[PDB]
Design an enzyme around this catalytic site. Structure first.
Site, PDB file in Angstrom:
ATOM      1  N   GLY B  46       3.085   7.154  23.297  1.00  0.00           N
ATOM      2  CA  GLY B  46       2.715   5.882  22.677  1.00  0.00           C
ATOM      3  C   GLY B  46       3.515   5.570  21.428  1.00  0.00           C
ATOM      4  O   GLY B  46       3.319   4.501  20.806  1.00  0.00           O
ATOM      5  N   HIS B 196      -1.129   5.822  15.020  1.00  0.00           N
ATOM      6  CA  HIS B 196      -2.140   5.947  16.079  1.00  0.00           C
ATOM      7  C   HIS B 196      -3.303   4.982  15.885  1.00  0.00           C
ATOM      8  O   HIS B 196      -4.284   5.032  16.639  1.00  0.00           O
ATOM      9  CB  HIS B 196      -2.676   7.365  16.227  1.00  0.00           C
ATOM     10  CG  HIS B 196      -1.615   8.414  16.264  1.00  0.00           C
ATOM     11  ND1 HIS B 196      -1.488   9.369  15.280  1.00  0.00           N
ATOM     12  CD2 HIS B 196      -0.633   8.661  17.161  1.00  0.00           C
ATOM     13  CE1 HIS B 196      -0.471  10.160  15.569  1.00  0.00           C
ATOM     14  NE2 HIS B 196       0.061   9.754  16.709  1.00  0.00           N
TER      15      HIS B 196
END
Lengths: 336, 334
Positions: B46, B196
């Site tokens: 990610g 994140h």
């Protein structure tokens, strides 16, 4: 004011480019480069890095940004072309938009009358829609990147203006793109299918099922709408006039070798583009299409649009050699 | 099977990489590369192109991705390290998250016991927040990219594992990052965000891009000074060793590399705007920007926002910067 800041940012980040003012355009810092065909393109802002990110050795000599999704004005193109001419002529690469066609035509005619050897390549690779918002025919999208590099390599090699143009028009006849959007730069889980890079409507809206399935139907459409007859206009510098030419594109077919561009329209995670490439490779293998080279990333954007496009360009050995040749730009860098 | 398809896409697109299965990790196709210190890193999926887009000559020898925002399990790290070791040892680069710390620690110790010369460099550049959701001390963000290149160049030149680790550690004490996100309500921003999606300093208003850069730049300066304990593997002693270390803030006379980083969904045009204002603040504070990178180097999926990283450098590290690199996401030199 924010356009200016962004342009000043580019100039500060890349001392190998020169930001001109009155009127505004960008060239290689070492332009005019003597002895070599100069390459020029330009268009609206909001497609970055196209075209300003492609200014450098082995690619563009200069580029003329317009305002957002708006063709540059012909004073920018004329002055830029004059700036980059190195005695061998200037080749103008033009995306098929009505404003771009109108403005690059005006400049070209006048450059010829000013004693500059010039001619033109039209890009119309978007297979989705004929006669969209701002386009007569098909839209000029991500294949422009691939042609700019390939023709850039030809120019840098020392090919004549005619050989460069002919290569560009031929590559134009063998490149095929299509884009999708999941969000504007649409209902839930619905995609705009066959979207264009300035916000234009696609073929329709349809459900977004999965990345794999979206890719299958993008791929299928490349094949289905591959065949295309149309008239394009090019500048004959010998006659000193516009010449209408009838050209037919053939669909890609089993046996063809291709370069593949998987292109972020603005806000697609990079992981997903590899997911797109994975499915694309499987579908090419099954069709008898060999992907020889690829680019995956944000090469032809539409501000912050959520979506991606696929471009497949037929190539041969000679074209692959031009692909592999050096390039040194903000957005594309390889070779010695 | 999206994550699997994605990694298969990467191996297909880049014949210079090998995708290993059971366990899953990525290396240079010519790994192990004899004669050079191998560099390895990893972390949650990610943050692409971090880390798998940094695998190649002059940068990483391999990388170990985990699940979405989740540390790779220690088997991946252990197996990747073994695959990449070319007899000169393995330097593990680790971003400061609790799961990253633990799993890298587990693998580093077992590797030492399995006969691999190994040490570690920890990255804690995010100036925004102490002790976020997944971090003890400061979060490790986009300075990882810059260190991985610079240390990558040192390894490729033939520097020893010790010299490479010492360089990595020094750089981590000279590099300073902060990020922001807009997607939060209308015209509001999460200031000091993580990669994140961890909370920042706060939510505040977004007035303009220039004003945002000004406050990001000020925060790099204000939270510049930092003292904390970091652990590294002493391979001579065969043990974890703690070292109290201090970062000085950026100051007048400093020369820096700048990274204006796209957190996922920021138009490229806007990053040049950020860079424009960044230079103005830099020059005003007597900081010289020598090199820059602008684009999507450490993402957080499709986050709307960006981060600024400044890394103090000298003539020697500029030479390492200019040295060849051949990876999916960074390519230059012969």
């Amino acid at each position: 004011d924010v356009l200016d800041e962004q342009l000043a940012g580019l100039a500060k980040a890349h001392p190998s480019l020169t930001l001109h003012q009155d009127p505004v355009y960008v060239t290689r810092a070492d332009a005019p480069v003597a002895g070599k065909v100069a390459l020029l393109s330009g268009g609206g802002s909001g497609n970055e890095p196209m075209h300003c990110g492609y200014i450098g050795q082995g690619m563009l000599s200069g580029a003329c940004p317009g305002e957002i999704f708006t063709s540059p004005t012909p004073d920018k193109i004329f002055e830029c072309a004059m700036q980059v001419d190195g005695g061998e002529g200037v080749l103008l690469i033009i995306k098929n938009y009505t404003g771009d066609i109108l403005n690059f035509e005006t400049a070209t005619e006048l450059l010829h009358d000013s004693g500059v050897k010039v001619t033109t390549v039209v890009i119309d690779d978007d297979v989705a829609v004929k006669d969209s918002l701002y386009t007569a025919g098909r839209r000029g999208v991500a294949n422009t990147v691939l042609i700019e590099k390939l023709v850039g390599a030809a120019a840098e090699r020392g090919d004549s203006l005619d050989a460069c143009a002919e290569l560009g028009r031929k590559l134009n006849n063998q490149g095929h793109s299509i884009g999708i959007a999941l969000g504007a730069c649409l209902a839930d889980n619905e995609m705009e299918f066959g979207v264009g890079i300035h916000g234009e409507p696609g073929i329709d809206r349809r459900p977004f099922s999965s990345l794999d399935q979206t890719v299958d139907e993008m791929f299928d459409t490349l094949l289905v709408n591959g065949s295309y007859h149309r008239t394009l206009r090019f500048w004959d510098y010998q006659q000193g006039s516009w010449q209408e030419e009838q050209q037919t594109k053939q669909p890609l077919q089993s046996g063809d070798r291709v370069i593949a561009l998987v292109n972020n329209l603005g806000a697609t995670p990079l992981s997903e583009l590899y997911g797109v490439y994975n499915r694309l490779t499987t579908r090419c293998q099954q069709a008898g299409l060999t992907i020889e080279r690829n680019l995956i990333g944000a090469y032809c954007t539409s501000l912050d649009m959520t979506g991606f496009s696929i471009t497949l360009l037929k190539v041969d050995d000679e074209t692959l050699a031009l692909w592999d040749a050096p390039v040194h730009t903000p957005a594309l860098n390889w070779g010695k």
